[PDB]
Amino acid sequence: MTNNKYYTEENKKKVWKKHMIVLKFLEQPGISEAYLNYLQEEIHNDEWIGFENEFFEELTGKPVINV
Amino acid sequence: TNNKYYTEENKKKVWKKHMIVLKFLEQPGISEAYLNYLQEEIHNDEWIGFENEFFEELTGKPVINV
């Protein structure tokens, strides 16, 4: 079995931390609304295979992670 | 294994949702607003422990390294 080169645990940590930084950015005035408008377009972009549940969790304001 | 929040299923969700957000950051003007916000935040106490991630994000260094 190939050891993972990108989806490593150290990368999961940095992505998690970088995602928290961007979350606070998305709360900045005007950013949220432009984000939701971006999600409204991308939901129809045929390059996202397997992301449908994530696109709609985000569009409908569901929490990023699940307890 | 006893983690309630930092879990492998959640890591997966964060990774995917992070990809969704990265393509948003490419949208016109979002890029520059993000860098401007990182600038505004560089002296902020709430981001202690996030220095390397702030630096990588501002310098253009990749989100993940092989």
Binding site: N4, K5, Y6, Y7, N11, V15 | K12, W15, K16, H18, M19, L22, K23, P62, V63, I64, N65, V66
Partner: peptide, 13 residues
């Protein structure tokens, strides 16, 4: 780097 995150997605198989 999006390409790298994508490759990392290819590894969730």
């Amino acid at each position: 780097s999006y390409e790298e995150m994508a490759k990392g997605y290819e590894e969730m198989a």
